[PDB]
mmCIF file of C-alpha atoms in Angstrom:
data_model
loop_
_atom_site.group_PDB
_atom_site.id
_atom_site.type_symbol
_atom_site.label_atom_id
_atom_site.label_comp_id
_atom_site.label_asym_id
_atom_site.label_seq_id
_atom_site.Cartn_x
_atom_site.Cartn_y
_atom_site.Cartn_z
ATOM 1 C CA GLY A 1 -111.781 -115.026 41.111
ATOM 2 C CA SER A 2 -115.194 -114.468 41.416
ATOM 3 C CA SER A 3 -118.028 -111.541 41.227
ATOM 4 C CA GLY A 4 -121.138 -110.666 42.748
ATOM 5 C CA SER A 5 -123.367 -109.442 40.108
ATOM 6 C CA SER A 6 -123.652 -111.470 36.941
ATOM 7 C CA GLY A 7 -121.026 -109.490 35.109
ATOM 8 C CA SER A 8 -121.264 -105.745 33.777
ATOM 9 C CA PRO A 9 -117.998 -105.054 32.123
ATOM 10 C CA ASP A 10 -118.535 -101.410 31.334
ATOM 11 C CA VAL A 11 -116.510 -98.447 32.757
ATOM 12 C CA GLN A 12 -117.884 -95.973 30.798
ATOM 13 C CA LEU A 13 -118.601 -92.372 31.982
ATOM 14 C CA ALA A 14 -122.292 -93.289 32.734
ATOM 15 C CA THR A 15 -121.221 -96.213 35.088
ATOM 16 C CA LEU A 16 -118.988 -93.560 36.886
ATOM 17 C CA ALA A 17 -121.622 -90.744 36.811
ATOM 18 C CA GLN A 18 -123.945 -93.577 38.331
ATOM 19 C CA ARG A 19 -121.805 -94.149 41.387
ATOM 20 C CA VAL A 20 -120.574 -90.585 42.030
ATOM 21 C CA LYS A 21 -124.289 -89.839 41.746
ATOM 22 C CA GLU A 22 -125.499 -92.664 44.013
ATOM 23 C CA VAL A 23 -123.285 -91.124 46.555
ATOM 24 C CA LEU A 24 -123.961 -87.309 45.548
ATOM 25 C CA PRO A 25 -127.479 -87.157 43.855
ATOM 26 C CA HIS A 26 -127.879 -83.570 44.301
ATOM 27 C CA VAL A 27 -125.072 -82.862 41.965
ATOM 28 C CA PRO A 28 -125.936 -82.756 38.514
ATOM 29 C CA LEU A 29 -124.864 -85.395 35.937
ATOM 30 C CA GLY A 30 -123.659 -82.819 33.384
ATOM 31 C CA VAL A 31 -121.306 -81.344 35.877
ATOM 32 C CA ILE A 32 -120.457 -84.809 37.197
ATOM 33 C CA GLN A 33 -119.593 -86.021 33.668
ATOM 34 C CA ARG A 34 -117.147 -83.171 33.466
ATOM 35 C CA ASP A 35 -115.932 -83.392 36.716
ATOM 36 C CA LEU A 36 -115.256 -86.832 35.920
ATOM 37 C CA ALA A 37 -113.098 -85.848 32.991
ATOM 38 C CA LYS A 38 -111.401 -83.461 35.326
ATOM 39 C CA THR A 39 -109.838 -86.730 37.154
ATOM 40 C CA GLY A 40 -111.563 -90.150 36.368
ATOM 41 C CA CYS A 41 -111.963 -91.611 39.790
ATOM 42 C CA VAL A 42 -115.306 -91.673 41.692
ATOM 43 C CA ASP A 43 -113.327 -91.086 44.861
ATOM 44 C CA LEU A 44 -111.666 -88.259 43.423
ATOM 45 C CA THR A 45 -115.182 -86.662 42.151
ATOM 46 C CA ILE A 46 -116.340 -86.993 45.641
ATOM 47 C CA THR A 47 -113.529 -84.682 47.035
ATOM 48 C CA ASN A 48 -113.423 -82.548 43.971
ATOM 49 C CA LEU A 49 -117.114 -81.618 44.605
ATOM 50 C CA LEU A 50 -116.229 -81.260 48.345
ATOM 51 C CA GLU A 51 -113.574 -79.128 47.908
ATOM 52 C CA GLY A 52 -112.318 -78.351 44.306
ATOM 53 C CA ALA A 53 -109.877 -80.719 42.637
ATOM 54 C CA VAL A 54 -109.681 -79.230 39.204
ATOM 55 C CA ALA A 55 -107.335 -80.183 36.344
ATOM 56 C CA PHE A 56 -106.773 -80.999 32.668
ATOM 57 C CA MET A 57 -109.592 -80.567 30.076
ATOM 58 C CA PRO A 58 -110.774 -82.120 26.816
ATOM 59 C CA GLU A 59 -110.718 -80.679 23.183
ATOM 60 C CA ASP A 60 -113.216 -79.905 20.460
ATOM 61 C CA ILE A 61 -113.315 -77.682 17.856
#
């Protein structure tokens, strides 16, 4: 049980948008953040972007 980097225990949207972005910088963060919510998996996002993969939705009055 070891880790490369010191240790950054954070899996927030940012942390995600980072990766997904790191792979696809072109795509905006605003959409990414959402696209992520549409699923919740960097890998997924990639595909979603590639094709579509859209479902679920948040709430807010």
